[PDB]
Design a binder for these strands. Sequence first.
DNA 1: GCCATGACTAGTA
DNA 2: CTACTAGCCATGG
Length: 108
Amino acid sequence: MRMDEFYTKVYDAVCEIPYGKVSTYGEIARYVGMPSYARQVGQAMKHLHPETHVPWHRVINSRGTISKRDISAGEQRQKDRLEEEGVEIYQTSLGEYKLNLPEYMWKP
DNA sequence: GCCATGACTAGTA
DNA sequence: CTACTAGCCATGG
């Protein structure tokens, strides 16, 4: 499986995530038939162009929190987007954006 | 080949 | 709950 195919399938899957719901890097990786490619799913989101209509903001980590980038802008950009879709985000003693996974998890 | 990087994760302490 | 691990694997130099 070429990587250009992987990116396309990941993007396909992410576009399926319904407005107001979220999924997981690991889930999308399993959904497209590549259980060990959680990190690569992360790459796929990163490599996206900013003007994309792919809802990358709907893909969080298995712990139900927003992953931290090298910078801090992307993280913040995801929270704002999610809140704009009605997702209730709450912060942490450690300053981690977190949500109720079972409540917002997209279950195919 | 090497190695460092990095939007990950199930497991363990 | 947090923190740190091994396993993980494409990417770029």
